Amino acid sequence: EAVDQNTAIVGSTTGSNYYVRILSTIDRELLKPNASVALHKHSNALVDVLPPEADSSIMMLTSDQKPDVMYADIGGMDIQKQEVREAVELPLTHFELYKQIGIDPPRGVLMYGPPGCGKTMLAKAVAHHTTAAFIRVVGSEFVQKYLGEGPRMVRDVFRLAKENAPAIIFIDEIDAIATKRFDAQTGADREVQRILLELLNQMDGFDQNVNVKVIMATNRADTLDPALLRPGRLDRKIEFPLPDRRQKRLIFSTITSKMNLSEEVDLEDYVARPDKISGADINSICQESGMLAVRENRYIVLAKDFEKAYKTVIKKDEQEHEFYK
Amino acid sequence: DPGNVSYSEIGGLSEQIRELREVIELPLTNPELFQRVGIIPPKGCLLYGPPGTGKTLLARAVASQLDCNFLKVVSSSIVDKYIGESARLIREMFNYARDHQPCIIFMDEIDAIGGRRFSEGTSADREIQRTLMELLNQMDGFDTLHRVKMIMATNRPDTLDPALLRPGRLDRKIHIDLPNEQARLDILKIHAGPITKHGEIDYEAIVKLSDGFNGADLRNVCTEAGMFAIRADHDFVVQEDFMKAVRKVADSKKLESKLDYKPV
Amino acid sequence: TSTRQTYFLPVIGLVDAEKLKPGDLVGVNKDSYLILETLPTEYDSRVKAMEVDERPTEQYSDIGGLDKQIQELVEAIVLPMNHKEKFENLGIQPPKGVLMYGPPGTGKTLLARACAAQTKATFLKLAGPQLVQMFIGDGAKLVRDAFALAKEKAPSIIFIDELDAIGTKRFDSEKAGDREVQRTMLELLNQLDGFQPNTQVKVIAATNRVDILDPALLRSGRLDRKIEFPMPNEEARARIMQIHSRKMNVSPDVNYEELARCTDDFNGAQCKAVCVEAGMIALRRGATELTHEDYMEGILEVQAKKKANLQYYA
Amino acid sequence: APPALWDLAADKQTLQSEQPLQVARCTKIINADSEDPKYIINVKQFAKFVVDLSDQVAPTDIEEGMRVGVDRNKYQIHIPLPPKIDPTVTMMQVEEKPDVTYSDVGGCKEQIEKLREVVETPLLHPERFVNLGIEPPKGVLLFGPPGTGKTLCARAVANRTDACFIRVIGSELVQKYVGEGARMVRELFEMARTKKACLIFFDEIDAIGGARFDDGAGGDNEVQRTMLELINQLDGFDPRGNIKVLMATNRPDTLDPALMRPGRLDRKIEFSLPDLEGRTHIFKIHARSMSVERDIRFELLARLCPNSTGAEIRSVCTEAGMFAIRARRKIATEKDFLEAVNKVIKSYAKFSATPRYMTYN
Amino acid sequence: LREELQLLQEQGSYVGEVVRAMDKKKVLVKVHPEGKFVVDVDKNIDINDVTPNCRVALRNDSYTLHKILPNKVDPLVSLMMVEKVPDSTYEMIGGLDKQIKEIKEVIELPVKHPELFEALGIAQPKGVLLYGPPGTGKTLLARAVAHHTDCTFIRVSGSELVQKFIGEGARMVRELFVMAREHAPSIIFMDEIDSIGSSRLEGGSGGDSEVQRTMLELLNQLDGFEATKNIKVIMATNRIDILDSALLRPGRIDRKIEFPPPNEEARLDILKIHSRKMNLTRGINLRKIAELMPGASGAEVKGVCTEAGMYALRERRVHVTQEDFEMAVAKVMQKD
Amino acid sequence: EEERSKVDDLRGTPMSVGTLEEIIDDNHAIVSTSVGSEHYVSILSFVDKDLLEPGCSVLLNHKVHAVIGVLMDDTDPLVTVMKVEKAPQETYADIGGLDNQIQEIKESVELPLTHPEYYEEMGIKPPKGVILYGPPGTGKTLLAKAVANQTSATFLRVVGSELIQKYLGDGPKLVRELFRVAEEHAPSIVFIDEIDAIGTKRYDSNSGGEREIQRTMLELLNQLDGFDSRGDVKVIMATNRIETLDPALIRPGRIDRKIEFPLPDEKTKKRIFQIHTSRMTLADDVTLDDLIMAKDDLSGADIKAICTEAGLMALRERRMKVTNEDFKKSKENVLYKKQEG
């Protein structure tokens, strides 16, 4: 921040707050509350900030530079996409409609359940059409040996997003940073969960308009803090709906429409017999019987391989705690 | 690993032996046979146990057997003391796995780095679960690792949490059980090969007397029997001492065979 | 660096690419940033040497009654020390895994060390408190270094203890600290199972009880010899204190059957203390020498329990 | 101020003596010496150096992994410093000064004497075991009611004739950050060996010595160390411990050190405890107190109080003075408190019998 | 410029925080990336001009203090507070006319009146709660009445990291009790532990026990000793622990108020309250829009026109029709 | 005089904050302060070289790092939780009819400090403290005793072992300082309200197992036992359930006293009630007796809080006067509070 006339406080890239009389000819206009200012070699004097910026990490793409995967193959998630349908395209392409309706667009998006996974690959989907940032980020990859790199990332993550906006950011498996802990060795992590708090702080600057889609995923909801689900943070929860007769017959048809299929193949018997348990991971199970064609010397997979995929995964009834009404 | 020929020196078992060749080798040489049918290549493999044993040697054997490029992952030092962020090192290793590709990776002990965070506690668990998140995301890409073959074996396939337990991260299910006495008949040959004695042998004798063992358990005690029999200072020893020693010694060794039966 | 930094330098300067692929301890001063010599080796303090001692100051020939089973044990240390030549004929490999156990005593604590006097190779003491780890990966890196310093000083001797401290991994989370340090044992296994180089410097283990640990430890690479040490019997029980009391004078009549017949549950160490309090009243008696009437009193004086009362019967 | 005036005077000689030896930072442990001129030293500042000495230091007088002084410019060897760890929890655990001598005994004669022959009788003359020795024994066992625990240690506090011994508080052994006290119990014995045979006593040894185990999940695991870790500290050949040991507890469990003590320790003795007689001395601990009325009788009250320990029956004689000051009674008559005694025994035995027999059973 | 560009290198410059001042004129200040220092005046700003726990500019040469700046503590606390819930007010709430006729006397009379507390002769009400469905507006009532009076608002734990952020370790409730000494009148709240799920009948007891104790030891540090007025606490639950509250309540010490289930009264206006910003014509029927939502919750009123707007959003219309509102009348009520 | 203008240059210009750690017995003090920087200080002024002691803080020079002065700095959660101060205005004349109970503890609250002589004129040494208990929920009526004890010495009231159960030990240690900071404030008095240790079972946050919670109470007494502590801090302790406490806590102390709280009788309720309604003006028909005469097995808190319900409706009408027509009818609400609640 700039404290008062002609001076201000700044941390270096070594993370120490300073007090310096700023360069005379530029007092304010480009300095701004939050930027990265180049500090004098000897003195660390306040002189000028970045353009801003080329920023630092990631920075975006992953579509034109690959990879990309077509979502249209899997249609069993349609009702799970119903959220993402209304919660992505129009929120980005219209900020004006949210003035007209009288309802504010939420940043809340959740994901959950894996396996069955979906999730990260479903985040690869909308990268086909909507052109924006896509950042692969976890909780544990941006852990550093120094505590101050968090805002050197997440505070830059925000200033690189809204400045390069329209842009979107998905944090894959955010659940790593939600752990409750004390010891001052984690005091850096306490500071990175203060950075999670500092990114919790400065992400609300997205309000209003341009721009973000806050989309979230966790396989376990235990340690997620109330301020992470805070009103105005997660207002929309997606869970994992289990694939079922529609989704099964969809996951039955979508896999075999590519690989060699037979008149021998009737999958309506398998929308019942294996469907009594799974569930799953059927997508890989759909590939498992395909992986059973490599046992040969084969062209079209047999039915004994269909059941072999079902007899390999999974068992059992069972059980001492399960079978007890 | 000596061998290569250690391939034939693991005794059993065919569908453990032969299938892992189709699971690993053929993906390398002929990916066309995958696209001929249209099946996606398996990018990894999984062992488990320990009914019977040999999960570590069969790996160790195939490494110098399958040849090509392979890199072993020592499971210990990853914790890295201060700042256990070293899950990055898997990417740092994966980066050259994308450079040196193709290359292969064996992993023993994925279970203790398979921490549950079931009911969370203290500190050293948090660095664990965080080191897991990258392993997921590395296989959750955003990337194609197909030219690396991830091989996984440990004590039990239980604590790993369901994220690993699905295909992708765990591509196939392979394991070992107690080798059959028919297959143990062969496991003694590769034990009885390097040891020379007087020519009196009945292989099925020890096989019918000594029952329900493992390759190393048999061998080491079979060599221990020769070592117990050479205590008499005489050189060559008939199976007499061995029909006694291996019998009696493994009886003591089967006292601690207790509680070896683990969930799948 | 020692300050964690890293530098990009024209090739050393002074010694050359001759050696090595990156090692430790490469001499450099500050801004000069050139490597003159690579000085061996390794690390660190007592992590380096757990215990380096001359040897036990006495020999096992004093204690007896456990002979035939340690006569089996002393082979495991001596046959790689010497008798491996017997296996060179028929192509056998020496035993690696071995275990020592039973409740005190027994006396392995003295005995498991007492065998190191006849090993003559350098010995290293490992114990549960060593496997207690402030930080993580040390014990692993320690065992990585312990078998460095083992194969480095090979032939050498290493014997461990309190295996039950790290014995169980629990099974299901959450969570154990030694569950990570079990991998040190798993690497100790991976070095004795998945790795060849552990072949030399035979390692022994001991516990107060074998109760619950990782049961898969059965193999030659991991622990093999399991010798149950029972309560010392009247053969040893008469001789143990006889060799413990050979240090001191005796009024030259003592049954030694009296105790040996009446010794029940008495440990070999209790017999060491039987002659103590017997000698303690001999002290406060002002006596010149110890007598059996003074001895046999010390039997029931140390054990058991009481005082309570003597009545109903008297 | 004349203290304060002379106090700021010699800072001149302090600043003149400041320049030499001031840079002796940092306290640093060495690593190895390959040959005569060379050394490598390692510090906790992260600085690791292979570096030489100041000529005042001889090579054979120094030990490996030894905290030393250094001038960090040359990185010389200034002087080695013996001490390492630990902080004030030691100086809390380590204790000094005397008090509470023999004569506070409540009449127990050879209950304390059997343990008086184990500790101070060998300490009076360590020469006593030159001729006859053999050995001063290894350890002891103590347990019973509260009366009187840790006062026999206080009895050893005042009657300690050599060096101030070290009490041990239980719940400071159990700690977070697995292995905290594990260092202590190990390293404090060398800190006790630094005091060359100065004795130690452990309190709440049943709590910290926890035994034995359950299948899952510990929990006790990290503490399963400390017990067997102390058994390793017991299984250390040296001395051991030149301090002998003295151990007081409550219940027979924990069993593992209690079944290890026949593997090492000796001398299992017991409280004392109430007796038909010694209560008169626990009633003669009040003898010189107050002024005993000529008609006050001990045996009269002593025969009326079974299973008295020492605790309440010390206050039993004291609760006379309770109602005395309350009722203005100038001195007390035995009838005065024995009215409130038969009260205070019953009134406090109505809810609580304090079944000491049940505690260890 | 060059002179200050000459001045500032040989030293640098920093910003300190004074934790104490000295009789010798020195001041206790930290170098925040590193260990603390203790420096002296600094003759422009005197000692009495600044108090401990304040922002100063650490000088870089004599390591003294250059200038004076404000410092923030509660803006971290109050932001963690204001994270959770907003306030609104009376006008933006409805259906509570019964219970606001009660709680208002609990709040304002200690703020406005208290000289007539002794006229009656009773002390401040120690606390209050609203039990019922979990449930809507009790937390609004908390912060809004805190805003109605402008008295500051506080909550209970607190996740992980508002704890050691104040102090180091303790019983930890005293520092929170010290917070209210800095700002009075103040409102403290239990967030949330209104639910039937936290019970477990054991494992949630001790978790709730200190949540129950967080009022108890505070009630023991409000009524038991210390001082004085203006401090209050609030509870919320449904059942179970409400009867377990009676375990804590043989009359000591709290006020018992019930939290009502919703009814058509609020349903009309509290939707009209949410209907201020939205675009809608005046041809909407209040009868069917209210009465089509029996039971449900107060959060039902939130979802009325949102998901109805979501399709009107998807439809792009400016102002909506009651049919789309009638569509979400089903939608948000399809789940139950 | 001149010394002040002399050594200020040696002090000058600034001085750091160190952490006092250990001493070379020659009085060269080795310190670990950020980051782990040592020094050797034998300096003549301001010391008191002994008592500054290991495990403290110091203030070091820049060149070179000599501690020229020291402080005692708290604040901290340590001192904050003990105080301040207070002495609320209530007295032991508030609770009548139980004087038999407090006249017992009268000598126990009196004899230490005030009126000490006949303790030492008898010389029998009864400084054993007190223990408390009673039904159903009491101990604020004993705070009505404790609010009177504020006339003498200094006092702190604590609640439970909770500060230990918040996390894996951590030992007693927060109790340790609270115990030994009472030595810093000695003479004083400390009380722990309604020990829940094993009375309550489950914990907040993370804790376990039983023995570590068992021993932190076992160490609570064993530190108070103690070896060997004269320090008072006269120890007041209470729990309303006599069951769950380990019975061994009585014998070391307090041995002589655990107060039995009798439930209020008919005239005690009469003696108690009017103290409240003394300030609240009753109407003409209001009578203390008949209501509490018919009602049975009440509590002093209720009979105090039964007046608050009239403090609503009469205050809803903004009336200074209580009405029994309401106080009868409104009592049904507090009656419903005890009956149905």
Curated annotation (Swiss-Prot), chain A:
Keywords: Acetylation, ATP-binding, Cytoplasm, Nucleotide-binding, Nucleus, Phosphoprotein, Proteasome
Positions contributing to ATP binding: 113-120
Gene Ontology CC annotations of this record: ciliary basal body; cytosol; membrane; nucleoplasm; nucleus; proteasome accessory complex; proteasome complex; proteasome regulatory particle, base subcomplex
Major subcellular site: cytoplasm
GO biological process: blastocyst development; proteasome-mediated ubiquitin-dependent protein catabolic process; proteolysis
GO MF term list: ATP binding; ATP hydrolysis activity; proteasome-activating activity
Protein location: Cytoplasm; Nucleus
N6-acetyllysine: residues bearing it: 304, 308
Lineage top rank: taxon: Eukaryota
Keyword Phosphoprotein: yes
Assembly notes: Component of the 19S proteasome regulatory particle complex. The 26S proteasome consists of a 20S core particle (CP) and two 19S regulatory subunits (RP). The regulatory particle is made of a lid composed of 9 subunits, a base containing 6 ATPases including PSMC4 and few additional components. Interacts with NR1I3. Interacts with PAAF1. Interacts with TRIM5. Interacts with ZFAND1.
Family listed: Belongs to the AAA ATPase family.
Protein name: 26S proteasome regulatory subunit 6B
Curated annotation (Swiss-Prot), chain B:
Chief place of localization: cytoplasm
Record flagged with keyword ATP-binding: yes
The keyword Disulfide bond is annotated on this UniProt entry: no
Residues given in the record as ATP binding sites: 49-56
Gene Ontology biological process terms, A to Z: ERAD pathway; positive regulation of inclusion body assembly; positive regulation of proteasomal protein catabolic process; positive regulation of RNA polymerase II transcription preinitiation complex assembly; proteasome-mediated ubiquitin-dependent protein catabolic process
Organism domain of life: Eukaryota
Modified residues annotated as N6-acetyllysine in this record: 81
Cellular compartments per GO CC: cytosol; cytosolic proteasome complex; extracellular exosome; inclusion body; membrane; nucleoplasm; nucleus; proteasome accessory complex
Residues found modified as Phosphoserine: 119
GO molecular function ontology, one term from the record: protein-macromolecule adaptor activity
Parts of the chain that traverse the membrane: none
Subcellular location: Cytoplasm; Nucleus
UniProtKB keywords: Acetylation, ATP-binding, Cytoplasm, Nucleotide-binding, Nucleus, Phosphoprotein, Proteasome
Subunit structure, as described in the record: Component of the 19S proteasome regulatory particle complex. The 26S proteasome consists of a 20S core particle (CP) and two 19S regulatory subunits (RP). The regulatory particle is made of a lid composed of 9 subunits, a base containing 6 ATPases including PSMC6 and few additional components. Interacts with PAAF1.
Family membership: Belongs to the AAA ATPase family.
Protein name: 26S proteasome regulatory subunit 10B
Source species: Homo sapiens
Lineage: Eukaryota, Metazoa, Chordata, Craniata, Vertebrata
Residues of the full protein shown: 126 to 389 of 389
Curated annotation (Swiss-Prot), chain C:
Localization annotation: Cytoplasm; Nucleus
Modified residues (Phosphoserine): 251
Keywords, comma-separated and alphabetical: Acetylation, ATP-binding, Cataract, Cytoplasm, Deafness, Host-virus interaction, Intellectual disability, Neuropathy, Nucleotide-binding, Nucleus, Phosphoprotein, Proteasome, Ubl conjugation
One term under GO cellular component: nucleoplasm
GO annotation terms (biological process): blastocyst development; modulation by host of viral transcription; positive regulation of proteasomal protein catabolic process; positive regulation of transcription by RNA polymerase II; proteasome-mediated ubiquitin-dependent protein catabolic process
Binding site for ATP: 102-109
The keyword Nucleotide-binding appears for this protein: yes
UniProt PTM comment: Sumoylated by UBE2I in response to MEKK1-mediated stimuli.
Gene Ontology MF: a single term: ATP hydrolysis activity
Domain of life: Eukaryota
Disease the record associates with this protein: Deafness, cataract, impaired intellectual development, and polyneuropathy: An autosomal recessive disease characterized by early onset of deafness, cataract, severe developmental delay, and severely impaired intellectual development. Patients later develop polyneuropathy of the lower extremities, associated with depigmentation of the hair in that area.
Family: Belongs to the AAA ATPase family.
Protein name from the UniProt record: 26S proteasome regulatory subunit 6A
Lineage, uppermost ranks: Eukaryota, Metazoa, Chordata, Craniata, Vertebrata
Gene encoding the protein: PSMC3
Portion held of the full protein: 126 to 439 of 439
Swiss-Prot record, chain D:
Binding residues annotated for ATP, in chain numbering: 144-151
Keyword Repressor: no
Disulphide linkage map: none
GO-annotated cellular components: cytoplasm; cytoplasmic ribonucleoprotein granule; cytosol; extracellular region; ficolin-1-rich granule lumen; membrane; nucleoplasm; nucleus
Modified-residue entries (N6-acetyllysine), positions: 44, 350
Molecular functions (GO terms): ATP binding; ATP hydrolysis activity; proteasome-activating activity
PTM comment: Monoubiquitinated by RNF181.
Subcellular location(s) per record: Cytoplasm
Keywords: Acetylation, ATP-binding, Cytoplasm, Nucleotide-binding, Phosphoprotein, Proteasome, Ubl conjugation
Induction pattern: Expression is not cell cycle-dependent and occurs throughout the cell cycle.
GO-annotated biological processes: osteoblast differentiation; positive regulation of proteasomal protein catabolic process; proteasome-mediated ubiquitin-dependent protein catabolic process; ubiquitin-dependent protein catabolic process
Principal subcellular localization: cytoplasm
Quaternary state and interactors: Component of the 19S proteasome regulatory particle complex. The 26S proteasome consists of a 20S core particle (CP) and two 19S regulatory subunits (RP). The regulatory particle is made of a lid composed of 9 subunits, a base containing 6 ATPases including PSMC2 and few additional components. Interacts with NDC80/HEC; this interaction is detected only during M phase. Interacts and SQSTM1. Interacts with PAAF1. Directly interacts with TRIM5. (Microbial infection) Interacts with HIV-1 Tat.
Membership in a protein family: Belongs to the AAA ATPase family.
The protein's name: 26S proteasome regulatory subunit 7
Native species: Homo sapiens
